[PDB]
C-alpha cells in the first residue's frame, strides 16, 4: 500500500480563506457547481447536401 | 530560497508504518526524546589549594616530598608547576662555533621519574617517564592535544636549537613556567576521590624526584650531529641547582547530610596501579630476537612495550632507531631513516604461544584502533590490551597474573635497527656513532583499596 | 537436522494506494481571526450612513 | 517565465499577448467574465510574497558598453510593476450609493 | 564522482588532480563539487525543497553526525538524530512508501570542465565525464533460533 | 515555427554560422477532461483506479 | 506529474502516472527543452548543406 | 522561519517569528551571502593599500 497526501496545503489555505464577501459571492445549497455538466436529450436528425 | 515543503510534508513519513516499525518504535512503555528526566544531585563546591611542602626546598637532580592538606572532604586533582631557567649559550663552549643547545623533546614527562604517592609510610602508587609517555600517547583526548603540547614543552620554541651568541642565531631559550598533571587513581575519575575526612590517621604524601639538568639539555653538534654532555662553563649564568616548583591540588567540600553519614563504614574501591618490568639491554648485531620474562601480581589490563635509543642520556623519549639531528632553518628534523626498531613481537604462556609472530603494524595500529581512544602519532609505542576499553574506569576483560605462571615476550628486531647499531654513517645521518637500544615493558593492573577505622590497607596484597 | 525457520507467508499488501488528510496541524497562521483583517473596518455602523 | 507568458493566457484568458512581458496569473477560470469565479481573499491572508529572477541578457544590458544602434549603448535601469484585479460589492438605496462592506 | 580515468580513484571533484611542484600531487585552482543544489520528491510532494549544496555539506554533518569531511563532495541527509548510534532512532520505511526521487543541479564549473580545451596542468585539458551514485543505510532484524539464522520479516 | 527553428542555417564556413537556440516548448494535451471545464476526472471519487 | 518509467528520451516510449489524491484534474500539458544544434564543416553536403 | 518584521540589512536589527503547527522545534541557524569586494586605485592609501 502507498501513502498519498490528499490535497495541497496551499489549496487548503485558499479554501480556509473565507469572509463575508466570499460568503455573499459563493456558497449556499442552491449554488451551482462547475466540474459537473448537466446532460439533456437532443432531437435526432441528419443533414445532407442536395443539388 | 523557495521552500515549498512545509510542515505537512512529514505527515506521510509519520503515517507510513509496518511490522518492522512496530517492533522497533512504539509501545506504551517506550521512552521518548524531547523530554529529559531531571534528578537532584549533591550540594558541593570545589576550589584549588596549595599543597604543603614538608621536605626542605626543591632543587634539580634531587628528591622533594609534599604532604596532602586536610580540611577537604575529597581531593580529585593534582598538578605540578615549574619555572624553567633561562638558557643562553656562550662562544667559549667546548664545541666552539659549531655547536647548538636545545631542550630535550618532551621536557615534561622528563625530569620527573619514579614519582610516587604514599599512604602513611606505604608506597601506594608510582609512575615514571615511560608510563607517562605511553599513557598520554594512547589515551589522549583529541582537541586538548595542542594544549598538552603547549603546556608540557615541545612548544616549537623550547625545542628549537639555538646557535652561539656570535653566530646567526643568538636567541635565548625563554624562561616560562610549565605545568604537568599527575595521573593518579583518584584523578582518573570523579567517582574515585580520596576521603581525607575519613583518613585522619594516615599521612598522605607525594614524593617527586627531579632529574639533573646536565642530561636535560641537548648539546648538539652543528655539522656531524654528535651529542656531548653540557657543562656549567658552556652556558651563561651557570646551572642553578635550586628551582621553584609547586604542587597544586583541588579539594571538594560537601554538606553534613552525607559527609558524616558515610563515615564509620567500610568502603571498597577499585584502583589502577602500575608494574614495570626491569629494563634489558639489546644488541641487534649479536642477536636477532630477545625474550623477556614478565612477572606481575594482579589482573593486568594492558601491556606497553617500546625499544628506546639510549646512546646519549641528554636526549629523551627517543624510541626511534636513529637519533634526531639538526636541520636547516635552526630547527630539528627527523633523519631520513627513522623507523621503529621492532620488526615483530609475540607472547608466550608456559610453552604455548597465545600470540603468533604477528607484525609490528598490528600492535602499532590495529590494537589502538579497536581498544583505545587514540592512535599514537610517533614511531614505536606498541600496545596489547586484554580489555575492550583501556581507558574505561569500570573493569573489563582482564587476566590475573598471580595465578598465571611465568610468561615471556619475544621481540624480533629489524634489519634497519641492525644496520643502525653499527656506525659509519656520514654527517647528520643520526647513526654516525654506534647505537645502543634498551627494551622497556610496562603493565597496568587493577587493585582493591579498603578504607576502615580511619586507615587504608590492601585486603589482598 | 533441525528444520530451518524463515518467513513463508507473503502477507497482505493491499493494491492501489491510501490517503492521509495532509492538513495543517493548528492553522494559527496563514489565516486571520475575523479581526485585524486589512482593508475592512469591523467597528462600523451599518450602511445607513449613506441613507 | 514562458509558462506565465503563454500557458495560462492560452488556457483561461481571452487572448494571448503579442509583445514581450505582461506575465499574468489568475485564480478565476475566465478573467473577462464578469461573473465571479474561483478567487482568494487576501484580507484574511497573512504576508504574501512574489519572487522574480532576472536574466543574463538583463544583467548584461544593465551596464553600458553597447555599440552604436544597439539600444544598450548607455547603462539601463529597470523597475518592477505589479497590478491586482479583484471584486467588490456596491449597494444602491435611498437615492445614494456606498459600499455595504467596504 | 569523476570517471574520466579508471586508474584514478576517489576523485569526487570536478577536475582531476595533476602533478605539482616538489613531486607532490597538486589540486588545480578550479576544483569544486559539481552539485549546486539537491532536493527530494515523494510522489509529487517535495519533502525537501531545493536546498543548497552547502547545507548537506556542512549543516547536516554538524548536527547529525560525528565528523565533517575535509574533501569536496560528500553530501548526506539523515532521518536520524545520530547516524553512528546503533540504537534505533527516527527513520522512514520505504516498503510502505511509493516511488521517491532525488533531483540534483549541476554547476557552471562542472559544465565548463565537461568541455576540454583547458591549458596545461589544469586537470580539464581533456573532456570530463561524471557519474552519480546514491547509497542508503537501513535497519533489519535477525532472529537466532534452532541453531540457524534468518530474516523473520525480510 | 517562430522563424528560428524552421529557418535553415548554413555551415560554419559560410556567412550563416548561427546556432539554433535551445529553449523550452509547451504542448497542451487534448483530452476529454481538457475539452470542457464541466468534464473533469473525479479523482476523489476514484480511489481504485490507476491513471 | 509523477514519473513511473525511467526518464524521457528521443525515440523511446515513457509513461507518466497521473498524480492522484486531487479532486478534479481538468488540464494537462507537456514541456520539453530542445537541444542545441550546431552544424560543422565536415558534413557530407559540405558547403551546400543546411540544417 | 516565519518572516514577520522587515528585511535583513547591514547595521539594522530585524526580528523573525517561530513558525507554529510543529510539534517540536529543536534547532536554528542563520545563512547569509557575502557581497563582492573589488579594490580600486582611487583608494586613499594609493598603491600601498589592501582590503
JSON list of C-alpha atoms in Angstrom, two decimals, chain G:
[
{"chain": "G", "resi": 1, "resn": "UNK", "atom": "CA", "xyz": [3.03, 14.67, -12.86]},
{"chain": "G", "resi": 2, "resn": "UNK", "atom": "CA", "xyz": [4.79, 11.72, -11.25]},
{"chain": "G", "resi": 3, "resn": "UNK", "atom": "CA", "xyz": [7.09, 9.67, -13.47]},
{"chain": "G", "resi": 4, "resn": "UNK", "atom": "CA", "xyz": [6.88, 5.88, -13.29]},
{"chain": "G", "resi": 5, "resn": "UNK", "atom": "CA", "xyz": [9.12, 4.68, -16.15]},
{"chain": "G", "resi": 6, "resn": "UNK", "atom": "CA", "xyz": [12.68, 5.99, -16.31]},
{"chain": "G", "resi": 7, "resn": "UNK", "atom": "CA", "xyz": [13.35, 9.33, -17.97]},
{"chain": "G", "resi": 8, "resn": "UNK", "atom": "CA", "xyz": [12.19, 10.75, -21.32]},
{"chain": "G", "resi": 9, "resn": "UNK", "atom": "CA", "xyz": [14.43, 10.11, -24.31]},
{"chain": "G", "resi": 10, "resn": "UNK", "atom": "CA", "xyz": [14.13, 10.64, -28.05]},
{"chain": "G", "resi": 11, "resn": "UNK", "atom": "CA", "xyz": [12.92, 7.61, -29.96]},
{"chain": "G", "resi": 12, "resn": "UNK", "atom": "CA", "xyz": [11.59, 5.97, -26.79]},
{"chain": "G", "resi": 13, "resn": "UNK", "atom": "CA", "xyz": [8.25, 5.49, -25.06]},
{"chain": "G", "resi": 14, "resn": "UNK", "atom": "CA", "xyz": [7.73, 6.66, -21.48]},
{"chain": "G", "resi": 15, "resn": "UNK", "atom": "CA", "xyz": [4.76, 6.54, -19.13]},
{"chain": "G", "resi": 16, "resn": "UNK", "atom": "CA", "xyz": [3.74, 9.13, -16.53]},
{"chain": "G", "resi": 17, "resn": "UNK", "atom": "CA", "xyz": [1.30, 8.36, -13.73]},
{"chain": "G", "resi": 18, "resn": "UNK", "atom": "CA", "xyz": [-1.37, 10.99, -13.12]},
{"chain": "G", "resi": 19, "resn": "UNK", "atom": "CA", "xyz": [-0.92, 12.42, -9.59]},
{"chain": "G", "resi": 20, "resn": "UNK", "atom": "CA", "xyz": [-3.80, 11.06, -7.54]},
{"chain": "G", "resi": 21, "resn": "UNK", "atom": "CA", "xyz": [-5.23, 12.49, -4.29]},
{"chain": "G", "resi": 22, "resn": "UNK", "atom": "CA", "xyz": [-6.65, 15.53, -6.08]},
{"chain": "G", "resi": 23, "resn": "UNK", "atom": "CA", "xyz": [-10.31, 16.39, -6.54]},
{"chain": "G", "resi": 24, "resn": "UNK", "atom": "CA", "xyz": [-10.65, 17.34, -10.22]},
{"chain": "G", "resi": 25, "resn": "UNK", "atom": "CA", "xyz": [-7.95, 17.05, -12.89]},
{"chain": "G", "resi": 26, "resn": "UNK", "atom": "CA", "xyz": [-9.03, 19.27, -15.77]},
{"chain": "G", "resi": 27, "resn": "UNK", "atom": "CA", "xyz": [-5.95, 20.33, -17.76]},
{"chain": "G", "resi": 28, "resn": "UNK", "atom": "CA", "xyz": [-2.56, 18.90, -18.73]},
{"chain": "G", "resi": 29, "resn": "UNK", "atom": "CA", "xyz": [0.42, 19.99, -20.80]},
{"chain": "G", "resi": 30, "resn": "UNK", "atom": "CA", "xyz": [3.90, 18.79, -21.73]},
{"chain": "G", "resi": 31, "resn": "UNK", "atom": "CA", "xyz": [7.03, 20.94, -21.62]},
{"chain": "G", "resi": 32, "resn": "UNK", "atom": "CA", "xyz": [10.19, 19.93, -23.46]},
{"chain": "G", "resi": 33, "resn": "UNK", "atom": "CA", "xyz": [13.61, 21.61, -23.71]},
{"chain": "G", "resi": 34, "resn": "UNK", "atom": "CA", "xyz": [15.00, 21.34, -27.23]},
{"chain": "G", "resi": 35, "resn": "UNK", "atom": "CA", "xyz": [18.73, 20.59, -27.62]},
{"chain": "G", "resi": 36, "resn": "UNK", "atom": "CA", "xyz": [21.35, 22.85, -29.23]},
{"chain": "G", "resi": 37, "resn": "UNK", "atom": "CA", "xyz": [22.09, 22.42, -32.94]},
{"chain": "G", "resi": 38, "resn": "UNK", "atom": "CA", "xyz": [25.45, 23.44, -34.43]},
{"chain": "G", "resi": 39, "resn": "UNK", "atom": "CA", "xyz": [26.41, 22.42, -37.96]},
{"chain": "G", "resi": 40, "resn": "UNK", "atom": "CA", "xyz": [30.03, 21.60, -38.78]},
{"chain": "G", "resi": 41, "resn": "UNK", "atom": "CA", "xyz": [32.11, 21.86, -41.94]},
{"chain": "G", "resi": 42, "resn": "UNK", "atom": "CA", "xyz": [32.71, 18.08, -42.08]},
{"chain": "G", "resi": 43, "resn": "UNK", "atom": "CA", "xyz": [29.16, 17.23, -43.18]},
{"chain": "G", "resi": 44, "resn": "UNK", "atom": "CA", "xyz": [28.54, 15.12, -46.27]},
{"chain": "G", "resi": 45, "resn": "UNK", "atom": "CA", "xyz": [26.99, 18.01, -48.21]},
{"chain": "G", "resi": 46, "resn": "UNK", "atom": "CA", "xyz": [29.93, 20.26, -47.34]},
{"chain": "G", "resi": 47, "resn": "UNK", "atom": "CA", "xyz": [29.30, 23.87, -48.29]},
{"chain": "G", "resi": 48, "resn": "UNK", "atom": "CA", "xyz": [25.90, 23.13, -49.87]},
{"chain": "G", "resi": 49, "resn": "UNK", "atom": "CA", "xyz": [24.39, 21.87, -46.63]},
{"chain": "G", "resi": 50, "resn": "UNK", "atom": "CA", "xyz": [21.74, 23.36, -44.35]},
{"chain": "G", "resi": 51, "resn": "UNK", "atom": "CA", "xyz": [20.22, 22.17, -41.07]}
]
